[PDB]
Amino acid sequence: FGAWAIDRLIGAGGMGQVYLGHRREVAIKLVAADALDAQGRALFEFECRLLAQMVHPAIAQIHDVGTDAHGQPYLVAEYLRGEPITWWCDEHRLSLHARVLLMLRVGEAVQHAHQKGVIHRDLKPSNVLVSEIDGRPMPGVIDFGIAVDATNPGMHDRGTPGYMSPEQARGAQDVDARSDIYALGAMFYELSCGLAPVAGRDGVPQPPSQRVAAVPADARARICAARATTYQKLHEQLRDGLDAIVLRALEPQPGARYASVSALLDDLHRWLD
Ligand SMILES: O=c1[nH]c2ccc(Cl)cc2c(N[C@@H]2CN3CCC2CC3)c1-c1nc2ccccc2[nH]1
């Protein structure tokens, strides 16, 4: 496949596959040939350009973009070793404080993409990988959405309930940076209390503190061990500000949410300080 050579499959979308490859280990994303019309293909090339311009340690470089000999659009990107952020933090038993530091780093990568006019649209643990580099947990944000609104509509869909914003779930036209903010909120909720956000009748989850308070003692013990804390300290630290921050990010109305990932970061730093 060009200067690049497929090793194994690592993902599928029904309208695209991702493979592990190599010249440097790469990801090679193939797009189904009938998924993008002339306009979608234009939009795809442009957004691929925008992505290629990002220079941030937490975002994969873009090596190549083209169309294969089967009519499929492709991109080659850096392959990032790592594990889903939530799973990684549990395995290495990070404190809330170390988790929030990683949240800042993830937020800084998403904020860098927003500033270059790029919105991810599918943030979730499997697209936010962590490894240890020079002793520190360092995140990698992968698999940005490209030309998602231009896809052949003749083709359980879209993103993941819980992470995807209500607007995206209602198939809305105006999906903006605030949708990534919602998804960060949902990820940060899980990092904080070890339980998924479940939107209740008013489209808002319980505060993390109340969520972990309701679960049985065995679930409670596991969550607290994975954060190197007692239940009572976990409950208090969440109540101290992480509840408010994650709930602001998870406001069902975009207008009531953080207006920017920059505003979310400021509140995370105020909690740490
Ligand atoms: O860089 C990667 N590293 C990984 C490491 C481990 C595993 Cl299991 C998957 C990926 C992985 N696939 C994810 C695993 N899962 C399915 C595909 C992808 C998102 C969630 C990517 C990746 N880099 C990409 C760059 C551009 C486009 C796609 C990309 N995928």
Tab-separated table of C-alpha atoms and ligand atoms in Angstrom:
chain	number	residue	atom	x	y	z
A	1	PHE	CA	0.000	0.000	0.000
A	2	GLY	CA	2.337	2.809	-1.245
A	3	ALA	CA	5.429	3.391	0.927
A	4	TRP	CA	3.279	1.627	3.590
A	5	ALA	CA	2.576	-2.089	4.310
A	6	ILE	CA	-0.461	-3.538	6.215
A	7	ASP	CA	0.432	-5.783	9.240
A	8	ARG	CA	-2.941	-6.407	10.970
A	9	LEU	CA	-6.498	-5.054	11.321
A	10	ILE	CA	-7.207	-3.070	14.516
A	11	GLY	CA	-10.615	-1.423	13.924
A	12	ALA	CA	-13.766	-1.367	11.766
A	13	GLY	CA	-16.606	1.119	11.186
A	14	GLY	CA	-18.757	-0.507	8.454
A	15	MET	CA	-17.684	2.465	6.292
A	16	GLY	CA	-13.968	2.192	7.102
A	17	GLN	CA	-11.208	0.030	8.600
A	18	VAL	CA	-8.059	0.912	10.548
A	19	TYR	CA	-4.951	-1.253	10.161
A	20	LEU	CA	-1.605	-1.421	11.889
A	21	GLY	CA	1.046	-0.815	9.185
A	22	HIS	CA	4.717	0.187	8.674
A	23	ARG	CA	7.216	1.795	6.256
A	24	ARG	CA	7.879	3.789	11.598
A	25	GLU	CA	4.695	1.960	12.755
A	26	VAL	CA	1.549	3.661	11.411
A	27	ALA	CA	-2.248	3.467	11.488
A	28	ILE	CA	-3.793	3.230	7.969
A	29	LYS	CA	-7.491	4.292	7.895
A	30	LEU	CA	-9.375	3.120	4.736
A	31	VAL	CA	-12.757	4.774	3.859
A	32	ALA	CA	-15.339	2.801	1.841
A	33	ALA	CA	-15.287	3.943	-1.819
A	34	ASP	CA	-19.008	4.856	-1.970
A	35	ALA	CA	-19.017	6.720	1.362
A	36	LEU	CA	-17.836	10.102	0.065
A	37	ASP	CA	-19.090	11.897	-3.064
A	38	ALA	CA	-17.085	14.614	-4.855
A	39	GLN	CA	-18.000	17.134	-2.097
A	40	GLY	CA	-17.349	14.710	0.792
A	41	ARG	CA	-13.997	13.886	-0.774
A	42	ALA	CA	-13.121	17.590	-0.987
A	43	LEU	CA	-14.200	18.056	2.619
A	44	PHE	CA	-12.126	14.994	3.673
A	45	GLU	CA	-8.922	16.233	1.973
A	46	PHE	CA	-9.280	19.724	3.484
A	47	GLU	CA	-9.873	18.457	7.055
A	48	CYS	CA	-6.981	16.028	6.626
A	49	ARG	CA	-4.874	19.128	5.771
A	50	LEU	CA	-6.076	20.943	8.939
A	51	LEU	CA	-5.137	17.875	11.005
A	52	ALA	CA	-1.724	17.721	9.316
A	53	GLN	CA	-0.984	21.297	10.561
A	54	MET	CA	-1.503	20.455	14.269
A	55	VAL	CA	1.872	20.100	16.073
A	56	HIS	CA	1.071	18.858	19.632
A	57	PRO	CA	2.739	15.996	21.593
A	58	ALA	CA	-0.660	14.371	22.260
A	59	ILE	CA	-1.832	14.253	18.630
A	60	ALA	CA	-0.704	11.756	15.986
A	61	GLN	CA	1.228	13.177	13.030
A	62	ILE	CA	-0.207	12.760	9.519
A	63	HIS	CA	2.156	11.136	7.041
A	64	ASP	CA	-0.079	10.705	3.991
A	65	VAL	CA	-3.515	11.091	2.438
A	66	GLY	CA	-4.769	9.596	-0.827
A	67	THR	CA	-7.135	7.281	-2.693
A	68	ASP	CA	-6.169	3.601	-3.177
A	69	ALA	CA	-6.486	1.414	-6.320
A	70	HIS	CA	-9.878	0.138	-5.085
A	71	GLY	CA	-11.267	3.698	-5.054
A	72	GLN	CA	-10.934	4.062	-1.292
A	73	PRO	CA	-9.779	7.319	0.422
A	74	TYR	CA	-7.058	6.593	3.026
A	75	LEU	CA	-4.912	8.405	5.605
A	76	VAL	CA	-1.611	7.237	7.187
A	77	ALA	CA	-1.012	8.548	10.755
A	78	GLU	CA	1.450	7.853	13.620
A	79	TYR	CA	0.460	4.739	15.612
A	80	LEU	CA	0.353	5.433	19.365
A	81	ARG	CA	1.014	2.628	21.807
A	82	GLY	CA	-1.183	2.987	24.869
A	83	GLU	CA	-4.251	1.794	26.728
A	84	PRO	CA	-7.700	3.452	27.099
A	85	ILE	CA	-7.276	6.298	29.621
A	86	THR	CA	-9.876	5.067	32.142
A	87	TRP	CA	-8.543	1.484	32.164
A	88	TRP	CA	-4.932	2.709	32.417
A	89	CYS	CA	-5.563	4.963	35.418
A	90	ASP	CA	-7.339	2.082	37.231
A	91	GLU	CA	-4.495	-0.344	36.492
A	92	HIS	CA	-1.814	2.057	37.754
A	93	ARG	CA	-4.027	3.122	40.700
A	94	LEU	CA	-3.767	6.897	40.126
A	95	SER	CA	-5.014	9.349	42.719
A	96	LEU	CA	-7.742	11.865	41.827
A	97	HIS	CA	-4.919	14.418	41.737
A	98	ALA	CA	-2.863	12.481	39.183
A	99	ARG	CA	-6.080	11.793	37.207
A	100	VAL	CA	-6.882	15.504	37.082
A	101	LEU	CA	-3.344	16.262	35.882
A	102	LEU	CA	-3.919	13.823	33.002
A	103	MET	CA	-7.321	15.478	32.375
A	104	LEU	CA	-5.507	18.807	31.965
A	105	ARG	CA	-3.107	17.215	29.445
A	106	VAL	CA	-5.996	15.646	27.471
A	107	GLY	CA	-7.876	18.979	27.587
A	108	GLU	CA	-4.806	20.850	26.274
A	109	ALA	CA	-4.608	18.540	23.195
A	110	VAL	CA	-8.369	18.968	22.451
A	111	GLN	CA	-7.995	22.773	23.031
A	112	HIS	CA	-5.089	22.867	20.518
A	113	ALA	CA	-7.280	21.146	17.875
A	114	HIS	CA	-10.186	23.551	18.580
A	115	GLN	CA	-7.825	26.504	18.056
A	116	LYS	CA	-6.832	25.078	14.651
A	117	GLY	CA	-10.539	24.726	13.699
A	118	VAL	CA	-10.784	20.952	14.258
A	119	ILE	CA	-13.445	19.180	16.325
A	120	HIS	CA	-12.941	15.517	17.224
A	121	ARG	CA	-16.605	14.528	17.571
A	122	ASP	CA	-15.880	11.028	18.926
A	123	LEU	CA	-13.890	11.385	22.161
A	124	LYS	CA	-14.110	8.280	24.357
A	125	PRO	CA	-11.554	6.155	26.309
A	126	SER	CA	-10.556	4.025	23.321
A	127	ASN	CA	-9.618	7.197	21.422
A	128	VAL	CA	-7.592	8.603	24.343
A	129	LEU	CA	-4.614	6.356	24.988
A	130	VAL	CA	-2.042	6.614	27.764
A	131	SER	CA	1.490	5.313	28.110
A	132	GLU	CA	4.431	6.200	30.420
A	133	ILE	CA	7.082	8.350	28.618
A	134	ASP	CA	10.137	9.651	30.603
A	135	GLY	CA	8.339	8.582	33.805
A	136	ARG	CA	5.150	10.503	33.136
A	137	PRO	CA	1.676	9.408	32.004
A	138	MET	CA	1.263	11.087	28.600
A	139	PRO	CA	-2.022	10.954	26.593
A	140	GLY	CA	-2.567	10.415	22.837
A	141	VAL	CA	-5.793	11.585	21.143
A	142	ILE	CA	-6.514	9.498	18.024
A	143	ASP	CA	-9.039	8.954	15.244
A	144	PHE	CA	-10.444	12.453	14.794
A	145	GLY	CA	-13.751	12.520	12.913
A	146	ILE	CA	-13.139	13.546	9.290
A	147	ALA	CA	-15.989	14.702	7.041
A	148	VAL	CA	-18.536	12.988	9.367
A	149	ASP	CA	-21.493	15.104	8.108
A	150	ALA	CA	-20.767	14.450	4.396
A	151	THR	CA	-21.093	10.686	4.509
A	152	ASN	CA	-23.393	8.782	2.182
A	153	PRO	CA	-26.611	8.554	4.311
A	154	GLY	CA	-27.628	5.292	2.623
A	155	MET	CA	-24.897	3.930	4.950
A	156	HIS	CA	-26.767	1.697	16.934
A	157	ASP	CA	-25.007	4.318	14.734
A	158	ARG	CA	-22.884	7.518	15.009
A	159	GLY	CA	-21.066	7.760	18.369
A	160	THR	CA	-21.379	6.128	21.781
A	161	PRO	CA	-24.327	6.873	24.137
A	162	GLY	CA	-22.939	8.420	27.324
A	163	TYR	CA	-20.007	10.166	25.582
A	164	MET	CA	-21.865	11.686	22.612
A	165	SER	CA	-23.690	14.947	23.312
A	166	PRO	CA	-27.521	15.148	23.150
A	167	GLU	CA	-27.228	17.435	20.098
A	168	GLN	CA	-25.155	14.784	18.243
A	169	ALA	CA	-27.549	12.057	19.389
A	170	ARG	CA	-30.511	14.029	17.948
A	171	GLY	CA	-28.651	14.201	14.602
A	172	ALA	CA	-28.200	17.960	14.918
A	173	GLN	CA	-26.687	20.203	12.235
A	174	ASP	CA	-24.881	22.555	14.642
A	175	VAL	CA	-22.292	20.297	16.347
A	176	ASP	CA	-19.403	22.418	17.630
A	177	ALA	CA	-16.618	22.460	20.233
A	178	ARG	CA	-19.195	22.114	23.037
A	179	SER	CA	-19.856	18.505	21.902
A	180	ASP	CA	-16.204	17.629	22.580
A	181	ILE	CA	-16.632	19.407	25.935
A	182	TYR	CA	-19.596	17.110	26.717
A	183	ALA	CA	-17.537	13.992	25.820
A	184	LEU	CA	-14.609	15.189	27.996
A	185	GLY	CA	-17.128	15.646	30.796
A	186	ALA	CA	-18.335	12.057	30.423
A	187	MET	CA	-14.773	10.704	30.354
A	188	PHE	CA	-13.779	12.821	33.395
A	189	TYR	CA	-16.904	11.560	35.234
A	190	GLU	CA	-15.674	7.967	34.784
A	191	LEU	CA	-12.068	8.829	35.766
A	192	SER	CA	-13.447	10.501	38.977
A	193	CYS	CA	-16.090	8.021	40.395
A	194	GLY	CA	-15.410	4.842	38.303
A	195	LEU	CA	-19.078	4.709	37.187
A	196	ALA	CA	-20.703	5.631	33.901
A	197	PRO	CA	-22.773	8.842	33.609
A	198	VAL	CA	-26.436	7.886	33.207
A	199	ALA	CA	-28.620	10.776	32.039
A	200	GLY	CA	-31.793	10.731	34.199
A	201	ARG	CA	-35.272	12.052	33.166
A	202	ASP	CA	-33.963	15.686	32.934
A	203	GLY	CA	-31.040	14.582	30.667
A	204	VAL	CA	-28.426	15.080	33.454
A	205	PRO	CA	-26.486	12.394	35.429
A	206	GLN	CA	-26.339	12.244	39.212
A	207	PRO	CA	-23.267	14.053	40.686
A	208	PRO	CA	-20.303	11.613	40.881
A	209	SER	CA	-20.342	11.801	44.686
A	210	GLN	CA	-23.971	10.650	44.878
A	211	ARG	CA	-23.373	7.957	42.187
A	212	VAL	CA	-20.530	6.244	44.174
A	213	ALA	CA	-22.590	6.702	47.400
A	214	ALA	CA	-25.474	4.623	45.991
A	215	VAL	CA	-23.431	1.576	44.793
A	216	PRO	CA	-22.921	-1.580	46.995
A	217	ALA	CA	-19.921	-1.985	49.297
A	218	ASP	CA	-17.934	-4.273	46.971
A	219	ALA	CA	-18.188	-1.824	44.020
A	220	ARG	CA	-17.255	0.990	46.427
A	221	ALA	CA	-14.105	-0.860	47.657
A	222	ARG	CA	-12.879	-1.518	44.098
A	223	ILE	CA	-13.438	2.097	43.018
A	224	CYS	CA	-11.558	3.437	46.092
A	225	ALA	CA	-8.643	1.023	45.707
A	226	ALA	CA	-8.247	2.061	42.035
A	227	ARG	CA	-7.908	5.693	43.241
A	228	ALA	CA	-5.689	4.991	46.315
A	229	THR	CA	-8.239	6.616	48.714
A	230	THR	CA	-10.920	5.923	51.338
A	231	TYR	CA	-14.595	6.221	50.416
A	232	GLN	CA	-15.054	9.245	52.726
A	233	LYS	CA	-12.080	11.185	51.220
A	234	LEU	CA	-13.232	10.293	47.676
A	235	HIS	CA	-16.761	11.554	48.483
A	236	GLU	CA	-15.394	14.818	49.970
A	237	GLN	CA	-12.876	15.529	47.152
A	238	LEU	CA	-15.615	15.007	44.555
A	239	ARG	CA	-17.990	17.257	46.503
A	240	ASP	CA	-15.136	19.865	46.776
A	241	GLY	CA	-15.434	20.698	43.040
A	242	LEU	CA	-15.025	17.758	40.622
A	243	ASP	CA	-18.842	17.144	40.786
A	244	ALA	CA	-19.602	20.737	39.693
A	245	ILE	CA	-16.939	20.718	36.925
A	246	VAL	CA	-18.063	17.390	35.352
A	247	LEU	CA	-21.749	18.383	35.662
A	248	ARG	CA	-21.119	21.750	33.986
A	249	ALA	CA	-19.432	19.872	31.092
A	250	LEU	CA	-22.411	17.481	30.951
A	251	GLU	CA	-25.107	20.221	30.905
A	252	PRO	CA	-27.761	18.899	28.436
A	253	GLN	CA	-27.985	22.385	26.826
A	254	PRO	CA	-24.803	23.633	25.043
A	255	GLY	CA	-25.587	27.168	26.219
A	256	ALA	CA	-25.290	26.053	29.905
A	257	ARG	CA	-22.025	24.161	29.244
A	258	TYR	CA	-18.438	25.477	29.366
A	259	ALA	CA	-18.118	27.689	26.266
A	260	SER	CA	-14.544	26.472	25.649
A	261	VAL	CA	-12.142	23.693	26.735
A	262	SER	CA	-10.077	26.688	28.052
A	263	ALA	CA	-12.831	27.482	30.632
A	264	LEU	CA	-12.973	23.796	31.637
A	265	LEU	CA	-9.156	23.709	32.129
A	266	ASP	CA	-9.269	26.872	34.345
A	267	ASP	CA	-11.742	25.165	36.758
A	268	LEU	CA	-9.625	21.930	36.816
A	269	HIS	CA	-6.518	24.017	37.756
A	270	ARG	CA	-8.515	25.875	40.468
A	271	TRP	CA	-9.531	22.498	41.971
A	272	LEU	CA	-5.902	21.287	41.950
A	273	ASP	CA	-4.689	24.590	43.498
B	1	LIG	O1	-2.834	4.801	17.032
B	1	LIG	C1	-3.561	3.869	17.405
B	1	LIG	N1	-3.160	3.075	18.419
B	1	LIG	C2	-3.872	1.988	18.883
B	1	LIG	C3	-3.314	1.184	19.881
B	1	LIG	C4	-3.987	0.078	20.331
B	1	LIG	C5	-5.238	-0.229	19.795
B	1	LIG	CL1	-6.044	-1.656	20.382
B	1	LIG	C6	-5.838	0.561	18.848
B	1	LIG	C7	-5.144	1.684	18.351
B	1	LIG	C8	-5.683	2.549	17.316
B	1	LIG	N2	-6.949	2.212	16.850
B	1	LIG	C9	-8.142	2.548	17.629
B	1	LIG	C10	-8.862	1.362	18.289
B	1	LIG	N3	-10.320	1.494	18.217
B	1	LIG	C11	-10.713	1.296	16.802
B	1	LIG	C12	-9.870	2.176	15.871
B	1	LIG	C13	-9.185	3.236	16.730
B	1	LIG	C14	-10.213	3.910	17.619
B	1	LIG	C15	-10.701	2.871	18.627
B	1	LIG	C16	-4.871	3.633	16.832
B	1	LIG	C17	-5.266	4.566	15.778
B	1	LIG	N4	-4.514	5.578	15.348
B	1	LIG	C18	-5.271	6.173	14.342
B	1	LIG	C19	-5.007	7.287	13.552
B	1	LIG	C20	-5.970	7.674	12.647
B	1	LIG	C21	-7.160	6.956	12.488
B	1	LIG	C22	-7.439	5.847	13.256
B	1	LIG	C23	-6.478	5.482	14.189
B	1	LIG	N5	-6.443	4.463	15.106
